[PDB]
Amino acid sequence: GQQFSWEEAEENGAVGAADAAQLQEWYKKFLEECPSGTLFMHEFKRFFKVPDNEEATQYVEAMFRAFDTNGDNTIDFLEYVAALNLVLRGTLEHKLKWTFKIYDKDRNGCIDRQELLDIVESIYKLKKACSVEVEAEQQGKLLTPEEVVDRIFLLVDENGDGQLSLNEFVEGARRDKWVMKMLQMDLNP
Ligand SMILES: [Ca+2]
Ligand SMILES: [Ca+2]
Ligand SMILES: [Ca+2]
């Protein structure tokens, strides 16, 4: 399927512009020390944020999951790079789709309170092993791990159909009243 690189390289002998140039170095700096060197969920989390407590692995592990879905357990240079443009540089609304996918842990085309508790739960383990404990209790009235889920579901939804489709979430994630800040997690810093 597809190829071993971008369509540009396939046709064009060396593409052009400072575009590929930037990638030429990336593709080389990574494959230079290893011909046909592919990345792995482990080599990624490491060569990227190489954390320590590891706890902050659930979050990243998700990234590779939502992005690396080909089903080969491996992620070639191409895939990775694609993610960058989707995050590194300015990110357009295209995020509404990719993010909606991050939650899709069961792969079915529909999101359910099951996926909500899954991802959020992950975001919790992250902010937990971070530089703060946000002492759930004394900190602004804590809640149950299932509460937040029922909060993002009800708000994003409204018909009570019992199913959170893309369009439903997309529009419910385009602005809402708090879905962004939360689901966003990073925000900017
Ligand atoms: Ca892959
Ligand atoms: Ca799903
Ligand atoms: Ca619905």
CSV table of C-alpha atoms and ligand atoms in Angstrom, one decimal:
chain,number,residue,atom,x,y,z
A,1,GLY,CA,0.0,0.0,0.0
A,2,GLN,CA,1.1,3.6,-0.6
A,3,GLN,CA,4.9,3.7,-0.9
A,4,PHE,CA,8.1,4.3,1.1
A,5,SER,CA,7.8,8.1,1.0
A,6,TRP,CA,5.7,11.0,-0.2
A,7,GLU,CA,4.1,11.1,-3.6
A,8,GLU,CA,6.4,14.1,-4.4
A,9,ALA,CA,9.6,12.0,-4.1
A,10,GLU,CA,8.0,9.2,-6.0
A,11,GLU,CA,7.5,11.3,-9.1
A,12,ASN,CA,9.9,14.2,-8.8
A,13,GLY,CA,13.5,13.2,-8.5
A,14,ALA,CA,14.1,15.6,-5.6
A,15,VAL,CA,11.0,17.7,-5.3
A,16,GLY,CA,12.3,21.2,-4.7
A,17,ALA,CA,11.9,24.3,-2.5
A,18,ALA,CA,13.1,24.4,1.1
A,19,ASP,CA,10.3,22.0,1.9
A,20,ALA,CA,11.8,18.6,1.3
A,21,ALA,CA,15.2,20.2,2.1
A,22,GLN,CA,14.0,20.4,5.7
A,23,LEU,CA,12.8,16.9,5.5
A,24,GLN,CA,15.9,15.7,3.7
A,25,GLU,CA,17.8,16.4,6.9
A,26,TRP,CA,15.1,14.8,9.1
A,27,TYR,CA,14.8,11.7,7.0
A,28,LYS,CA,18.6,11.5,6.9
A,29,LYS,CA,19.5,12.4,10.5
A,30,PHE,CA,17.2,9.5,11.5
A,31,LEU,CA,17.9,7.0,8.7
A,32,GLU,CA,21.6,8.0,8.3
A,33,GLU,CA,22.7,6.2,11.3
A,34,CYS,CA,20.3,3.4,10.3
A,35,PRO,CA,19.3,2.5,6.7
A,36,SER,CA,15.6,1.8,6.4
A,37,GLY,CA,15.4,2.6,10.1
A,38,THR,CA,11.8,2.6,11.3
A,39,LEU,CA,10.4,4.1,14.5
A,40,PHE,CA,8.8,2.1,17.4
A,41,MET,CA,6.3,3.1,20.1
A,42,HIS,CA,9.4,2.9,22.4
A,43,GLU,CA,11.9,4.7,20.2
A,44,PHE,CA,9.3,7.4,19.7
A,45,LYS,CA,8.3,8.1,23.3
A,46,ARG,CA,12.0,8.1,24.1
A,47,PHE,CA,13.6,10.1,21.2
A,48,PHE,CA,10.8,12.5,21.8
A,49,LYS,CA,10.2,13.4,25.5
A,50,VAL,CA,12.3,10.6,27.1
A,51,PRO,CA,10.5,11.1,30.4
A,52,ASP,CA,11.4,9.4,33.7
A,53,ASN,CA,8.4,8.4,35.8
A,54,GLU,CA,7.1,6.8,32.6
A,55,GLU,CA,3.7,7.6,34.0
A,56,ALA,CA,3.5,10.3,31.3
A,57,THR,CA,3.5,7.4,28.8
A,58,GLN,CA,-0.2,6.9,28.6
A,59,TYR,CA,-0.7,10.3,27.0
A,60,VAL,CA,2.0,9.9,24.4
A,61,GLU,CA,1.2,6.2,23.9
A,62,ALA,CA,-2.2,7.5,22.8
A,63,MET,CA,-0.7,9.8,20.2
A,64,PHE,CA,1.1,6.9,18.5
A,65,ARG,CA,-2.1,5.0,18.8
A,66,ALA,CA,-4.3,7.5,17.2
A,67,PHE,CA,-1.7,8.2,14.6
A,68,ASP,CA,-0.1,4.8,14.2
A,69,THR,CA,-3.2,2.7,13.2
A,70,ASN,CA,-1.9,1.1,10.0
A,71,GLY,CA,-1.8,-2.1,12.1
A,72,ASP,CA,2.0,-2.7,11.6
A,73,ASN,CA,2.9,-1.8,15.2
A,74,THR,CA,5.6,0.3,13.5
A,75,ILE,CA,5.6,3.9,12.3
A,76,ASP,CA,7.7,4.9,9.4
A,77,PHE,CA,9.3,8.4,9.1
A,78,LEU,CA,6.4,9.5,6.9
A,79,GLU,CA,3.6,8.9,9.4
A,80,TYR,CA,5.5,10.6,12.2
A,81,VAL,CA,6.3,13.8,10.2
A,82,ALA,CA,2.7,14.1,9.2
A,83,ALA,CA,1.8,14.3,12.8
A,84,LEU,CA,4.2,17.2,13.3
A,85,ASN,CA,2.5,19.4,10.8
A,86,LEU,CA,-0.7,18.4,12.6
A,87,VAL,CA,0.7,19.7,15.9
A,88,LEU,CA,4.2,21.3,15.7
A,89,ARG,CA,3.2,24.1,13.3
A,90,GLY,CA,-0.1,26.0,13.6
A,91,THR,CA,-3.0,23.5,13.8
A,92,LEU,CA,-6.2,24.2,11.9
A,93,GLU,CA,-9.6,22.8,12.6
A,94,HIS,CA,-8.4,19.5,11.2
A,95,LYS,CA,-7.8,18.8,14.9
A,96,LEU,CA,-11.5,18.2,15.4
A,97,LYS,CA,-11.2,15.1,13.3
A,98,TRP,CA,-7.9,13.7,14.5
A,99,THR,CA,-8.8,14.4,18.1
A,100,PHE,CA,-12.2,12.8,17.6
A,101,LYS,CA,-10.1,9.8,16.6
A,102,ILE,CA,-7.8,9.8,19.6
A,103,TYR,CA,-10.9,8.9,21.6
A,104,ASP,CA,-11.9,6.3,19.1
A,105,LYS,CA,-10.2,3.5,21.0
A,106,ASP,CA,-12.7,0.8,19.9
A,107,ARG,CA,-12.6,1.7,16.2
A,108,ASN,CA,-16.2,1.7,15.2
A,109,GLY,CA,-17.0,5.2,13.9
A,110,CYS,CA,-18.9,6.3,17.0
A,111,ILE,CA,-17.8,7.7,20.3
A,112,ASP,CA,-19.3,6.5,23.6
A,113,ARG,CA,-18.9,7.3,27.3
A,114,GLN,CA,-16.5,4.4,27.2
A,115,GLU,CA,-14.0,6.2,25.1
A,116,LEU,CA,-14.5,9.4,27.1
A,117,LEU,CA,-13.4,7.7,30.4
A,118,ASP,CA,-10.5,6.1,28.6
A,119,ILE,CA,-8.8,9.1,27.3
A,120,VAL,CA,-9.6,11.5,30.1
A,121,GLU,CA,-8.4,8.8,32.5
A,122,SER,CA,-5.2,9.0,30.6
A,123,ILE,CA,-5.0,12.8,30.8
A,124,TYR,CA,-5.4,12.4,34.6
A,125,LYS,CA,-2.4,10.1,34.9
A,126,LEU,CA,-0.4,12.7,33.0
A,127,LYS,CA,-1.3,15.8,35.0
A,128,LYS,CA,-0.8,13.5,38.0
A,129,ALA,CA,2.9,12.7,37.4
A,130,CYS,CA,3.5,16.2,36.3
A,131,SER,CA,4.9,19.1,38.4
A,132,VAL,CA,1.7,19.2,40.5
A,133,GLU,CA,-0.8,17.0,42.4
A,134,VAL,CA,-3.8,19.3,42.1
A,135,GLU,CA,-4.9,17.5,45.3
A,136,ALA,CA,-8.3,16.6,43.8
A,137,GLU,CA,-10.1,17.2,47.1
A,138,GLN,CA,-9.0,20.5,48.7
A,139,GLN,CA,-8.7,22.3,45.3
A,140,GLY,CA,-12.2,23.1,44.1
A,141,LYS,CA,-14.4,20.2,45.0
A,142,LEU,CA,-13.3,17.0,43.3
A,143,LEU,CA,-15.5,14.5,41.5
A,144,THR,CA,-15.7,11.0,40.3
A,145,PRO,CA,-13.7,9.6,37.3
A,146,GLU,CA,-17.0,9.1,35.6
A,147,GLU,CA,-18.4,12.5,36.4
A,148,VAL,CA,-16.2,14.4,33.9
A,149,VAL,CA,-17.2,11.9,31.3
A,150,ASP,CA,-20.9,12.5,31.8
A,151,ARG,CA,-20.1,16.2,31.8
A,152,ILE,CA,-18.4,16.2,28.4
A,153,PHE,CA,-21.0,13.8,27.0
A,154,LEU,CA,-24.2,15.7,28.1
A,155,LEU,CA,-22.8,19.1,27.1
A,156,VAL,CA,-21.5,18.0,23.7
A,157,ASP,CA,-24.8,16.1,23.1
A,158,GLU,CA,-28.3,17.3,23.4
A,159,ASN,CA,-30.7,14.9,21.6
A,160,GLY,CA,-29.8,12.1,24.0
A,161,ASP,CA,-29.7,9.8,21.0
A,162,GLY,CA,-27.3,7.7,23.1
A,163,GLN,CA,-24.5,8.0,20.5
A,164,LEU,CA,-21.8,10.7,20.0
A,165,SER,CA,-21.3,11.0,16.3
A,166,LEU,CA,-18.5,13.0,14.7
A,167,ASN,CA,-20.7,15.9,13.4
A,168,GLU,CA,-22.3,16.0,16.9
A,169,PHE,CA,-19.0,16.2,18.6
A,170,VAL,CA,-17.3,18.3,15.9
A,171,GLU,CA,-19.8,21.1,16.4
A,172,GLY,CA,-19.9,20.4,20.1
A,173,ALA,CA,-16.1,20.7,20.1
A,174,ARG,CA,-15.9,23.7,17.8
A,175,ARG,CA,-16.8,26.0,20.7
A,176,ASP,CA,-19.1,24.6,23.4
A,177,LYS,CA,-18.6,26.2,26.8
A,178,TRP,CA,-15.8,24.2,28.4
A,179,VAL,CA,-15.3,21.1,26.2
A,180,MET,CA,-12.3,22.9,24.5
A,181,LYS,CA,-10.3,23.8,27.5
A,182,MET,CA,-10.7,20.3,29.0
A,183,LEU,CA,-10.3,18.0,26.0
A,184,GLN,CA,-7.5,20.3,24.9
A,185,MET,CA,-5.4,19.6,28.0
A,186,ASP,CA,-2.3,21.4,26.7
A,187,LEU,CA,-4.0,24.7,25.7
A,188,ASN,CA,-0.6,26.2,24.9
A,189,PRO,CA,2.0,26.0,27.7
B,1,CA,CA,2.3,2.7,10.9
B,2,CA,CA,-15.2,5.1,18.9
B,3,CA,CA,-26.3,12.0,19.9
